Amino acid sequence: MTTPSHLSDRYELGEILGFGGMSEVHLARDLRDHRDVAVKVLRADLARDPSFYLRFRREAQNAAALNHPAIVAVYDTGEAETPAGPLPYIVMEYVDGVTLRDIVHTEGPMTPKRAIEVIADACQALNFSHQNGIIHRDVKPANIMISATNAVKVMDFGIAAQYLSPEQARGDSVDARSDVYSLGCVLYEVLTGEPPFTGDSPDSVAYQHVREDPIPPSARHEGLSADLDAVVLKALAKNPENRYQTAAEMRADLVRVHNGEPPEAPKVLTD
Numbered sequence: 377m378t379t380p381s382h383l384s385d386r387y388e389l390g391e392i393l394g395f396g397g398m399s400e401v402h403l404a405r406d407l408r409d410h411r412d413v414a415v416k417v418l419r420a421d422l423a424r425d426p427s428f429y430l431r432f433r434r435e436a437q438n439a440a441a442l443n444h445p446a447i448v449a450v451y452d453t454g455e456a457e458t459p460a461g462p463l464p465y466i467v468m469e470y471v472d473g474v475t476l477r478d479i480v481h482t483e484g485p486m487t488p489k490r491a492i493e494v495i496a497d498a499c500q501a502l503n504f505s506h507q508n509g510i511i512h513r514d515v516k517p518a519n520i521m522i523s524a525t526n527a528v529k530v531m532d533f534g535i536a537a538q539y540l541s542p543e544q545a546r547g548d549s550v551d552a553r554s555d556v557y558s559l560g561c562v563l564y565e566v567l568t569g570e571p572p573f574t575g576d577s578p579d580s581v582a583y584q585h586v587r588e589d590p591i592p593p594s595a596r597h598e599g600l601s602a603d604l605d606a607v608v609l610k611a612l613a614k615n616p617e618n619r620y621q622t623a624a625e626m627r628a629d630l631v632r633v634h635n636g637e638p639p640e641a642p643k644v645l646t647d
């Protein structure tokens with residue numbers, strides 16, 4: 377089973393760009409609008425599996441279409457009839473670049489200034505989203521890309537364990553502060569090279585989000601300041617009331633640190 381060369385007589389697929397647990401993402405030429413796009417298609421090896429097919433459809437009707445320089449646009453959704461059966465897809469803005477998951481794996485931790493810049497730009501995407509009534513819900517390294525021209529692109533908004541917030545783990549209500557906490561997880565990882573919590577199972581990692589304090593970034597990797605510790609650990613506070621309340625507030629503290637000014641986050645002491 378493979379993915380077809382064309383979808384709906386309009387998209388002509390080229391190189392495979394990436395994959396995840398459900399989907400493959402291909403560069404395509406949109407023959408109708410003369411545009412390069414990324415087409416996210418249900419995985420060919422999973423496309424006949426009812427659980428994955430239905431999940432793909434349930435998620436496509438919720439994938440948020442937002443218009444912002446820092447957010448991957450969603451152009452359309454569709455489904456191709458192949459000789460093996462229906463193959464649903466979503467057409468979106470193509471990013472020529474790498475995900476943060478790619479970068480941390482291949483290059484290790486980013487310099488702190490660069491991590492700060494990238495996460496600060498991600499805050500602006502989240503801020504825009506929240507203002508528009510959309511919680512991201514799945515902020516994680518594979519959902520943030522840096523393009524070949526160094527622009528930050530955040531993607532896959534609005535679809536309801538290393539990056540779960542405590543409230544998601546508990547099945548409580550999730551709101552913008554959930555995104556703040558998950559972005560804190562990503563920040564932690566680009567800074568140290570590791571997510572804040574690892575374990576044998578998803579459930580063990582979820583348990584840690586709920587009950588255990590992260591080890592301060594400065595203890596996990598050299599060259600990280602106490603000021604950065606304070607920002608990261610505030611984003612990762614267990615109680616939503618103790619985090620940054622908005623993506624904008626998190627960004628304001630990141631900007632402070634970028635400019636060598638003291639963050640407003642509570643100080644954190646080690647040793």
Ligand SMILES: Nc1ncnc2c1ncn2[C@@H]1O[C@H](COP(=O)(O)OP(=O)(O)O)[C@@H](O)[C@H]1O
Pocket residue numbers: 393394395396397398399400401414416448468469470471472473475518519531532
């Ligand atoms: N708009 C895009 N432009 C370029 N590459 C993309 C785009 N969207 C996703 N990708 C690549 O496809 C991979 C799979 O995406 P996705 O199916 O959303 O998996 P995940 O849930 O791991 O984010 C991503 O990690 C990334 O490498």
Ligand SMILES: [Mg+2]
Pocket residue numbers: 395396397398399400
């Ligand atoms: Mg996937």
Ligand SMILES: [Mg+2]
Pocket residue numbers: 477516517518519
């Ligand atoms: Mg990831």
Ligand SMILES: [Mg+2]
Pocket residue numbers: 396518519531532
């Ligand atoms: Mg994704």
Ligand SMILES: [Mg+2]
Pocket residue numbers: 499500503623624625627
């Ligand atoms: Mg902002």
